[PDB]
Amino acid sequence: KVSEQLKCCSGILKEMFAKKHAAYAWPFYKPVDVEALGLHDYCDIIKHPMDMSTIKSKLEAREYRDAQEFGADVRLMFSNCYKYNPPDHEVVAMARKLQDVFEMRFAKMPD
Numbered sequence: 784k785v786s787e788q789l790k791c792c793s794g795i796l797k798e799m800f801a802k803k804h805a806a807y808a809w810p811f812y813k814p815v816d817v818e819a820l821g822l823h824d825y826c827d828i829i830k831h832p833m834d835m836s837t838i839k840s841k842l843e844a845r846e847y848r849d850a851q852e853f854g855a856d857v858r859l860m861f862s863n864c865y866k867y868n869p870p871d872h873e874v875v876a877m878a879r880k881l882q883d884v885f886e887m888r889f890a891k892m893p894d
């Protein structure tokens with residue numbers, strides 16, 4: 784039931800990584816490469832960076848006690864995007880489309 788909810792969390796991440804959503808999910812797959820992109824203000828503005836590969840690793844390493852802790856990291860990832868980027872940036876629209884996928888699945892987690 785709590786392992787089942789963490790099993791459901793694995794499924795949520797599988798959906799977010801799936802080819803169907805790749806057109807808008809791709810910016811969230813891996814951590815922001817500060818050096819490559821010259822975003823030398825990112826670590827000042829975003830104190831707790833998060834991405835889907837980091838969440839996957841934490842789920843695999845049992846760093847989430849329950850679905851609420853997993854959900855908190857997914858929402859941190861989206862919140863960081865909304866905080867750092869101008870509200871009209873394409874990546875903000877992409878965040879909203881991927882968050883739509885996450886919120887619908889997370890809401891329908893059996894208990």
Ligand SMILES: CNC(=O)CN(CC(c1ccccc1)c1ccccc1)C(=O)c1cc(C)c(OC)c(C)c1
Pocket residue numbers: 809810811813814815816820822863864867868873874877
């Ligand atoms: C594998 N490479 C990346 O993920 C690059 N990138 C997204 C990138 C972008 C997204 C949408 C349309 C066009 C470009 C980008 C680069 C620089 C600033 C914003 C968006 C990122 O590494 C990335 C960067 C930031 C600041 C992000 O917000 C936290 C995210 C989610 C990804």
